[PDB]
Design a protein around this ligand. Sequence first.
Ligand code: NA
Ligand code: NA
Ligand code: NA
Ligand code: NA
Ligand code: NA
Lengths: 477, 477
Amino acid sequence: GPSFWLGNETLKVPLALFALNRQRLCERLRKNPAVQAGSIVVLQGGEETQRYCTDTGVLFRQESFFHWAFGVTEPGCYGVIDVDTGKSTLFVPRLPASHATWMGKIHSKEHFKEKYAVDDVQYVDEIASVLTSQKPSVLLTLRGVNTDSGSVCREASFDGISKFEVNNTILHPEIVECRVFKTDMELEVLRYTNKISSEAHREVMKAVKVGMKEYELESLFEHYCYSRGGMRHSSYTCICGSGENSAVLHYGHAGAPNDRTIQNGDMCLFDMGGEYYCFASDITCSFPANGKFTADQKAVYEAVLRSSRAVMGAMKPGVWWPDMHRLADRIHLEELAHMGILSGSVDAMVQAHLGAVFMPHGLGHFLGIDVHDVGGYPEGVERIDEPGLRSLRTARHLQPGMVLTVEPGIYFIDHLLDEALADPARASFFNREVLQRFRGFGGVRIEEDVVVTDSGIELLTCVPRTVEEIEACMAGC
Amino acid sequence: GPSFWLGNETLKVPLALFALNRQRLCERLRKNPAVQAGSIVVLQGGEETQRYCTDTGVLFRQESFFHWAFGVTEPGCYGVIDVDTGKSTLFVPRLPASHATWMGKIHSKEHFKEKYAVDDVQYVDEIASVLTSQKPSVLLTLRGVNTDSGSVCREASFDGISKFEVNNTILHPEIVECRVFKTDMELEVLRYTNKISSEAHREVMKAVKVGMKEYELESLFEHYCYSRGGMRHSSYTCICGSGENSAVLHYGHAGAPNDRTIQNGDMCLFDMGGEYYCFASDITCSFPANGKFTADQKAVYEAVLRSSRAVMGAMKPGVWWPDMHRLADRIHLEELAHMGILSGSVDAMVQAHLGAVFMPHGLGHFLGIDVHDVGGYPEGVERIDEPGLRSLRTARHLQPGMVLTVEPGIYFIDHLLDEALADPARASFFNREVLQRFRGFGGVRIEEDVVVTDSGIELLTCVPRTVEEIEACMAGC
Ligand code: NA
Ligand code: NA
Ligand code: NA
Ligand code: NA
Ligand code: NA
């Protein structure tokens, strides 16, 4: 059948991918004992937006659940799925015949039907009529709480919906759960987003020169991803932290917009990932600006390399994700002790949650259509109220088909260091004369994207990682 | 004093630019007989947003009126200006000390005071208490209708505002009028945005090759603008129309995403403009994909060049903008007749509104902090209900300090030509034996940004324009 493509060397994504998603959603819904026969899933697509009160258009990116189900790139659509039959209907805007002037061809409904391989296409203004005709028992709409933002999903509405029975509680947990497990077709797209983003990271490492602004590398990264990968969007705002900014976890946003001059001796921590057809990638590379690790930089870096590889090697079905977080903590503490920053029993350090002083964020998260993907905390899976672990975006056990980032890091963050040094249960583990050398060091994060397999993981990311590989890459070898 | 700068060769913009805007707004309001003594202007800044229900952040860009008055890059602020004294107070978010875990150093109020050169800085949650202590007579808030989008400006609101007298009618027309007339400091920024965008257009003409995707040039343009000009945003989504797509006026949006392969013999129409520190640029260059104009391409192109230069030569204070639109129409019609596409009396063609068949859009618009800048249709200025002229974004008379685009074009749009050919009042002008050669030609638009001076215009844009210049640029001169 048909495929989404941006030509050149970009990936052809079969529209069958979305058909399979629709089938899987229906299969799950049919197993749910609360679901009535004759139910119809109703999703509302994103709409075109403008900046504030202006007419300045914002580039449209589809809403993630709607994209998962339909793969539709146009704004202003709806999509419905008969649960019992699996039959899909796309609803497209009826554009005035007088509109070929400003926006482009006025495509027929037949064009959209063949483009998206759905069962039927109707106009948005006909939705109440078309639904009334099907005599559904209930409309299943999307409403629930995203566990990363705390936002409530936008439930579909249309002129005439009040005439229907509507259930807005059943669908969200089921569609979330389907999104958690990537199909083989979805994995092909994620391999591709990781391929292009990995190439772009390598180009950035080759291009970095002392004296550049951080944003020069952001620009280069996005230019590679778009011109060579067809990635018009990134998956999140690029983090190009250099020097002390590598310790700033929330960096690159408008209040800290990648505007520091990279200096000789600085570490760089670049967390960037292109998006292709609404599928994410998320990769972080850390390396010395000047292309040569100092002894202290090599020590910190190789500690995170060790925890990265230990977590990847331990991951397999049945592994509890918080145990991976604690595994990384333990390794970091051992290496920070080997380095002389810490002294004493690593067992006692773990008991005092010292790892969270150095890695306050979660070890990694699900990834898919959203970079922080849905389904980390379904009902019955509890957040753990401890330093570090409270920041984890899932406390689930791993299963085949889950896609995770693995992103341990070690940072020297003054607020956290100083808090630990004030606490008698934690202060004694520090050698202050050694820690002093590391104030302003910045931080190192190594982030890989992986898929859980039947026996372990498959790594999607392909960037230089050892000190040797990084130095050779940056030397222009 | 302090300036905004992104380093390297980027423009240093003094924060005194915004202080001057605030002073101008107060001087205007002091002269307004309806403004009460002790009035305070209250503006609310833009807030940080995420994609839909996800935690994926959208890169924050300040709201335009708020930017014009304060130049503040951070989300979540408010700003007030005492009218009688001109005293400015910025209100900033209160971040808890623990956010230093994720954000590095949390900036003090003093930091923001020095950064923005305002008189005072307070936390947002203290706004009601601070205003109460000032004992203002009335708060002047922003509400009015944007004449391009039809949207209503977001009026400031905070907890406790109901305890004050609020006027939401006076401010909008006044602050809009200040924005219409650019200061010397603003013109320096618009000259810079034109310089960078001009260079980037030149790089695109040098790089275009038959066989590329349109979006490869969008990517290159945006990369030049960000890496070399510090332009993180474009002023609007890039329009990169090749071949038939050059006749689609706002091509490049999500539904038509610059995804055509450029062919030998195609015309390209590239409408792209970087934004620096929320100041716009808007430039359109038209040129043959293969670097060599055919006779037909040269004739259409030079017709638009003729109207471009006639309008620029005619613009001066006191000129009614709709007269410039009609001037361009007349020239296009003369030239289309001189190339054999039309025959008969140009006077009769103008009476028949034939110009609007070839140029269905307005001649040009105000430009400033928004690409389609505010103030085109203040109370008393009426829209003209005629083809072409109906699309004008202003019917004002020109005055010194206004900034306008001058963007005549000629396009071969099938549904417009077909309408004309089906209308006995218009059909007779066409020579179908010559017209047939231009079906699928696309279109040409030449867009310059200019400032109205005391006696004429200043051209901001600096790209090759003659056939000879364009061929030389594409040949790498
Ligand atoms: Na990341
Ligand atoms: Na991540
Ligand atoms: Na393993
Ligand atoms: Na334009
Ligand atoms: Na324009």
